[PDB]
UniProtKB/Swiss-Prot annotation:
Organism lineage string: Eukaryota, Metazoa, Chordata, Craniata, Vertebrata
Record keywords, A-Z: Cell membrane, Cell projection, Cilium, Disease variant, GTP-binding, GTPase activation, Lipoprotein, Membrane, Myristate, Nucleotide-binding, Palmitate, Protein transport, Retinitis pigmentosa, Transport
Gene Ontology molecular function, alphabetical: GTP binding; GTPase activator activity; magnesium ion binding; unfolded protein binding
Gene label: RP2
Disease: Retinitis pigmentosa 2: A retinal dystrophy belonging to the group of pigmentary retinopathies. Retinitis pigmentosa is characterized by retinal pigment deposits visible on fundus examination and primary loss of rod photoreceptor cells followed by secondary loss of cone photoreceptors. Patients typically have night vision blindness and loss of midperipheral visual field. As their condition progresses, they lose their far peripheral visual field and eventually central vision as well.
Listed name of the protein: Protein XRP2
Organism: Homo sapiens
One GO BP: protein transport
Tissues in which the protein is found: Ubiquitous. Expressed in the rod and cone photoreceptors, extending from the tips of the outer segment (OS) through the inner segment (IS) and outer nuclear layer (ONL) and into the synaptic terminals of the outer plexiform layer (ONL). Also detected in the bipolar, horizontal and amacrine cells in the inner nuclear layer (INL), extending to the inner plexiform layer (IPL) and though the ganglion cell layer (GCL) and into the nerve fiber layer (NFL) (at protein level).
């Protein structure tokens, strides 16, 4: 029996509360008028609203639609969602995975870091919510009321300083890691400042092992000291392929119909040559686009996001 009473936390002060996997299953959640609380929703949701909360610590599992904060202050959060909205809030710190551009309004001191979190059930919770781990624009904030009102968290932030793992016997049954290498969402730098002006685009096409290949390639590049700037998972038409891949397009055209492509953007000096080498050594006989040169890589990237931001 599903009833709205079981899908809310309201009017609490100085408590830890939460939801175990399977316990929400895509339903809708409300957190309202809580002060000094720690709240852990270890499941996928349709939408979550957080109203009038103060000094709270919040984990939200994959949200299929929108997360809305209204009238909250001094909360620290880790969450994944399709859309993110902050209205009339102050001093929020968020480790975010968001499929669209995060939006703030009438708010100040809003700080953003990349989602960094793992537990065994998380990957299927993302699939059930229809959220790709590769669609994350956590740092590209739009402020509806400029007067600057947001910034990025420090890059070396230890998640456990902001959003501690739960202690309680109930919530312990969930096997959490907040280590960067365990994170279900790949750590991307987004709009963080760059020390290299060399980029490299990789596009992987739909297939048995495409996601695992993308993870392996990120691991290889990042272990060599290259930066993962951003990723994407989108359907690609012949037109889009022609603009991005240029003369290499015809080799890849037969692969587009099978399903969404995965784009990876890397950053660092020698990124293009290094990436091509890793792709040759480790994925012989798997078709993969890699930027041809440093000169052309930035246009690869811009052409990709151009079509990908539309669809």
């Amino acid at each position: 029996k599903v009833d709205p009473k079981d899908y809310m936390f309201s009017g609490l002060k100085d408590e830890t509360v939460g939801r175990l996997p399977g316990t929400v299953a895509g339903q809708q959640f409300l957190i309202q008028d809580c002060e000094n609380c720690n709240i852990y929703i270890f499941d996928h949701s349709a939408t979550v609203t957080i109203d009038d909360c103060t000094n709270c610590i919040i984990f939200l599992g994959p949200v299929k639609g929108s997360v809305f904060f209204r009238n909250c202050r001094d909360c620290k959060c880790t969450l994944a969602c399709q859309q993110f909205r902050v209205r009339d809030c102050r001093k929020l710190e968020v480790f975010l995975c968001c499929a669209t551009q995060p939006i703030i309004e009438s708010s100040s001191n809003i700080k953003f870091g990349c989602f960094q979190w793992y537990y065994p059930e998380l990957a299927f919770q993302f699939k059930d919510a229809g959220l790709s781990i590769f669609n994350n624009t956590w740092s590209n904030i739009h402020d509806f009321t400029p007067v600057l009102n947001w910034s990025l968290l420090p890059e070396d932030a230890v998640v456990q300083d902001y959003v501690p793992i739960p202690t309680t016997e109930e919530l312990k049954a969930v096997r959490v890691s907040t280590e960067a290498n365990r994170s279900i969402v790949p750590i991307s730098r987004g709009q963080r400042q760059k020390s290299s002006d060399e980029s490299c685009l990789v596009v992987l096409f739909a297939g048995d092992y495409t996601i695992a290949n993308a993870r392996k390639l990120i691991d290889e590049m990042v272990g060599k000291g290259f930066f993962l700037v951003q990723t994407k998972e989108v359907s690609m038409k012949a037109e889009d392929a022609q603009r991005v891949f240029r003369e290499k397009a015809p080799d890849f055209l037969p692969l587009l119909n099978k399903g969404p492509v995965i784009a990876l953007e890397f950053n660092g000096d020698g990124a293009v040559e290094v990436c091509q080498l890793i792709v040759n050594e480790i994925f012989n006989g798997t078709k993969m686009f890699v930027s041809e040169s440093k000169e052309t890589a930035s246009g690869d990237v811009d052409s990709f996001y151009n079509f990908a931001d539309i669809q």
